[PDB]
Amino acid sequence: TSAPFISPMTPYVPEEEPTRTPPSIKDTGTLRPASEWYPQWMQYRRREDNYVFWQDKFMRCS
Amino acid sequence: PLTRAVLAVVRVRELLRALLLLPFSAVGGAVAAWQGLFNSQRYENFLMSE
């Protein structure tokens, strides 16, 4: 251990700033394309819970 | 027999009259297809994603 004062049982790895924006919310992990406008899971959620669409757009764009 | 003979004549001449204008109507149908692509909701979705 290097830690003079405080050392938990798992060494601290210095995490840095992220360097790229996350995959959007609409994309899947695979190669098949997204959905032109609205995802399909949006239909199985409360109308007052689907605000994450436009919030994700705001976050990635601005 | 006679009236359907006159109809057969008008049908053959209709074949000819339809074929003589075929390039014009071909370009017309191509233009109709072209301008049909650009008023869907699909084109609106594309414009908003862009």
- The token pair at A54 is 């436009």
How far apart, in Å, are the Cα atoms of A26 and each of A33, A39, A53, A54, B11?
A: 10, 6, 8, 11, 57
How close, in Å, is residue A6 to chain B by CA atoms?
50
3-state secondary structure A16-30: CCCCCCCCCCCCCCC
Chain B partners within 8 Å of A37 (Cβ):
45, 48-49
* Total number of residues shown for chain B: 50
C-alpha span between B8 and A15 (Å, rounded)? 87
Closest chain B CA to residue A26: B49
Please count the residue pairs, one from chain A and one from chain B, whose beta carbons lie less than 8 angstroms apart: 7
**Ramachandran region, residue A3 (left: φ > 0; alpha: ψ -120 to 50; beta: rest):** beta
How far apart, in Å, are the Cα atoms of B49 and each of A56, A58, B27?
A: 14, 13, 31
Chain A partners within 8 Å of B40 (Cβ):
none
* Total number of residues shown for chain A: 62
